[PDB]
Amino acid sequence: CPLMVKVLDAVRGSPAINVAMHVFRKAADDTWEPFASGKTSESGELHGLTTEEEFVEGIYKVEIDTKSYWKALGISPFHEHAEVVFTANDSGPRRYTIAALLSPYSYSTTAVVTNP
Amino acid sequence: CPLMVKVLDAVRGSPAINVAMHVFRKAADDTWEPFASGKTSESGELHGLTTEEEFVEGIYKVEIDTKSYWKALGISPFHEHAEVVFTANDSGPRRYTIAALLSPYSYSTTAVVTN
Amino acid sequence: CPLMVKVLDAVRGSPAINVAMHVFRKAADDTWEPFASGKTSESGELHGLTTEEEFVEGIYKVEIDTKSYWKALGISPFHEHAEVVFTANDSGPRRYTIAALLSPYSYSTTAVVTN
Amino acid sequence: CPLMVKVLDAVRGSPAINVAMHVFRKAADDTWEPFASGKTSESGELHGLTTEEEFVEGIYKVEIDTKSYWKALGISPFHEHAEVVFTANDSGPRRYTIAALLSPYSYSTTAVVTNP
Ligand SMILES: CCOC(=O)/C=C/c1ccc(O)c(O)c1
Ligand SMILES: CCOC(=O)/C=C/c1ccc(O)c(O)c1
Numbered sequence: 001c002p003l004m005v006k007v008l009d010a011v012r013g014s015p016a017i018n019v020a021m022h023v024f025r026k027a028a029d030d031t032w033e034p035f036a037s038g039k040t041s042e043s044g045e046l047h048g049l050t051t052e053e054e055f056v057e058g059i060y061k062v063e064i065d066t067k068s069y070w071k072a073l074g075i076s077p078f079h080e081h082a083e084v085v086f087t088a089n090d091s092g093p094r095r096y097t098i099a100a101l102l103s104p105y106s107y108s109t110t111a112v113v114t115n116p
Numbered sequence: 117c118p119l120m121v122k123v124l125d126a127v128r129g130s131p132a133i134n135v136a137m138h139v140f141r142k143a144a145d146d147t148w149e150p151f152a153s154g155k156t157s158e159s160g161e162l163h164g165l166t167t168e169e170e171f172v173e174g175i176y177k178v179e180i181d182t183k184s185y186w187k188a189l190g191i192s193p194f195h196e197h198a199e200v201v202f203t204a205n206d207s208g209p210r211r212y213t214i215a216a217l218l219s220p221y222s223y224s225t226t227a228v229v230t231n
Numbered sequence: 232c233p234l235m236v237k238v239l240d241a242v243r244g245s246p247a248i249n250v251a252m253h254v255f256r257k258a259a260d261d262t263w264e265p266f267a268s269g270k271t272s273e274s275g276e277l278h279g280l281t282t283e284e285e286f287v288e289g290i291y292k293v294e295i296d297t298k299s300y301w302k303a304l305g306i307s308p309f310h311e312h313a314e315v316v317f318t319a320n321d322s323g324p325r326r327y328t329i330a331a332l333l334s335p336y337s338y339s340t341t342a343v344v345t346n
Numbered sequence: 347c348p349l350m351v352k353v354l355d356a357v358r359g360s361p362a363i364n365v366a367m368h369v370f371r372k373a374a375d376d377t378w379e380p381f382a383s384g385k386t387s388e389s390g391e392l393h394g395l396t397t398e399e400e401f402v403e404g405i406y407k408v409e410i411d412t413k414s415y416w417k418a419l420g421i422s423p424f425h426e427h428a429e430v431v432f433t434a435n436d437s438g439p440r441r442y443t444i445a446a447l448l449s450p451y452s453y454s455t456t457a458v459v460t461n462p
């Protein structure tokens with residue numbers, strides 16, 4: 001599991017459950033190509049997006065559908081989604097944990113990168 | 117000044133100065149059309165991006181070049197840039213301030229929407 | 232204005248208005264002596280807490296009553312308050328802005344220190 | 347484990363390791379009494395601070411020694427420490443995860459509260 005995403009709700013002090021996200025990888029022609037997708041579990045985590053073999057060097061974008069999340073709670077949020085764009089595996093394979101903390105008008109995102 | 121952006125540096129505790137950014141507006145074919153751009157001032161602020169006549173309802177993306185900012189400081193950053201994507205919605209009388217707080221491996225952004 | 236505090240509301244995307252806070256200065260017996268206090272304005276800012284003659288080096292604590300703020304909005308908060316504890320250090324010419332961004336179960340604070 | 351604290355470093359994109367913290371509980375005379383203490387592990391986590399029996403209703407303060415952390419990395423930070431003060435177990439036993447994200451001039455803290 002070289003890529004895991006964890007989403008928290010700062011309003012309810014809970015994991016953010018059933019949050020959809022799409023991962024994209026930049027192709028040689030500079031377009032974003034679909035790479036993987038999924039929804040967070042009860043712990044607010046999404047595991048198993050990719051494998052070490054498949055997760056090659058490149059520029060990746062994680063689009064977290066924060067807007068649908070807030071909507072289903074009755075909240076009309078500011079952002080369309082939270083975006084995280086980064087170069088991966090530039091110096092060799094790493095494990096990446098992307099954490100996102102959500103409020104209706106704010107979000108923060110951090111990465112934990114560890115050497116396999 | 118319907119839209120202003122403020123950027124802060126969490127490593128040095130200062131405004132983030134000379135940060136470049138581009139603002140895009142979502143087009144009907146779902147591509148991003150450039151709309152406005154600039155560099156943050158000494159106060160870390162970017163003013164005069166648009167006018168209220170021009171700033172109509174729609175989806176907007178602010179793309180902040182955080183990577184070049186950290187490179188200039190000699191610090192290896194995680195993100196390619198920081199993106200803030202939002203819908204502008206008439207309410208009516210409203211001004212938008214988008215604040216970003218930057219660290220090498222983290223960023224946070226908030227909107228202050230007033231009248 | 233050597234020290235100013237700004238508070239923002241991440242749930243409503245606005246300044247946090249009428250937030251009460253107290254500033255303490257660490258005494259030699261390691262207890263906190265009240266120093267200054269006030270309520271945030273309509274811009275979510277608290278100015279005029281101290282003067283530069285009075286604002287000498289030392290350890291300071293700003294205690295922001297976030298709990299009363301969320302109670303007034305009908306939202307059950309996690310924190311009793313938000314505390315920012317820092318050392319003021321001559322550098323020399325410096326102004327301090329302490330910003331806090333509040334959510335019911337989270338807060339973030341940053342210092343912008345300029346000249 | 348009704349109380350766990352997790353500390354992350356936003357400058358290095360890593361867990362914040364060997365970070366000291368002290369926990370205090372407000373006594374009936376309004377003073378802060380020592381409750382528990384420890385240092386974060388290699389995963390940036392501190393487990394086993396307390397037990398369900400011992401962790402009664404009350405107002406608790408977690409003082410995270412962020413200043414020593416930054417110092418040992420050669421950084422002169424803004425804050426003396428990060429403080430988290432909260433009422434616990436007011437409606438019955440809960441499990442609390444306190445997360446703290448650190449930069450030299452900034453920190454954020456969030457709580458995840460789950461019903462046992
Ligand atoms: C409009 C002025 O914004 C500030 O001075 C600070 C904003 C801010 C945004 C996010 C944060 O986490 C924070 O601590 C502060
Ligand atoms: C138990 C939560 O584990 C985490 O990775 C929390 C990360 C985190 C992300 C953003 C924040 O503002 C924060 O305080 C914490």
Ligand SMILES: [Ca+2]
Nearest residue numbers: 001004047048
């Ligand atoms: Ca995993």
Ligand SMILES: [Ca+2]
Nearest residue numbers: 347350393394
């Ligand atoms: Ca545990």
